[PDB]
């Protein structure tokens with residue numbers, strides 16, 4: 198049984214199925230869980246999940262208190278309910294996250310330390326309630342560094358991925374490799390729901406929805422200020438609505454991706470049909486980011502009626518580089534109010550820094566960019582309105598900037614290079 202939620206957009210968008218869970222509650226204390234943050238509740242949570250799924254589904258409930266746990270592995274038809282004043286406290290002991298599981302790390306498929314909340318090929322999975330996800334960060338802060346053995350592991354992963362070595366031979370949870378695990382990583386799932394809860398820090402990517410089809414993300418209060426902490430990362434996913442969330446980030450708010458180079462070309466699964474509305478960025482560098490990992494294709498993305506009241510680097514930022522191939526098509530931003538920004542819109546087709554020297558270019562393939570649309574945007578103060586840097590070998594096409602007003606411009610209005618069919622309509626600015 199399902200409701201369906203209708204979503205308006207400038208492209209076709211099917212209504213989104215929302216599972217109605219069976220009215221059954223599996224309390225983790227009935228399977229041996231103990232609060233206070235020192236008893237390890239990994240096994241109790243797993244036993245509650247097994248019983249719920251065997252019964253046909255329902256809620257696995259974490260009541261008020263602090264509950265220490267290792268990873269939580271979903272099965273189908275489970276809603277993990279965090280009650281008000283519940284805190285899931287995750288351990289920072291790497292051995293609790295073994296054995297390794299199938300995942301994707303910075304756009305390359307591999308086996309790594311289990312994500313803290315992990316779902317693989319499930320249907321009808323949810324996290325809900327007014328409680329909090331709160332990982333311990335001690336060990337993971339140490340793993341922010343990039344010493345020699347960590348660089349060796351990144352090279353190993355990239356070489357295997359780039360030469361089509363089977364994913365099971367990409368075993369990364371070994372020795373000092375030190376690839377940090379995701380907070381939420383849902384992989385190849387159908388009918389996802391995330392509703393109501395708080396996030397306080399994350400070891401790696403905060404909310405990773407990877408190769409998923411159909412879902413809703415709403416009423417979230419996300420705060421994470423460590424390394425590689427975007428608010429939400431959609432990767433090779435489709436048919437999602439995001440609404441009514443707040444983002445307070447070390448990096449960007451909403452980011453759309455589709456993997457890195459050859460490994461992604463192999464998977465051939467674009468990220469598409471995602472709508473974001475009524476959201477708010479409080480801290481962070483970018484409101485809507487596309488890429489740099491876009492290799493599988495990105496198409497039909499719509500953000501509207503959102504705010505960024507404080508200060509950002511780039512409000513709308515589209516990125517790729519010469520290794521990526523793929524395409525970026527039909528990206529829309531509408532009805533956004535901004536405080537301060539360095540750029541309102543930027544397109545940069547050669548963003549390559551950390552991976553520039555570490556590994557080689559196996560193949561140059563220039564990304565096709567077509568249809569980037571910004572309408573009804575205000576910014577109080579900007580260094581520049583927009584800056585577009587295309588590749589001469591395959592220029593960017595069809596960019597529209599319309600009903601855009603900037604209260605004060607500090608450096609320059611615009612700079613354009615290797616872009617065709619740029620349409621500016623009713624742009625207003627002031628400058629001195």
Ligand SMILES: [Ca+2]
Nearest residue numbers: 549550551552
């Ligand atoms: Ca790079």
Ligand SMILES: [Ca+2]
Nearest residue numbers: 457458520552
């Ligand atoms: Ca690369």
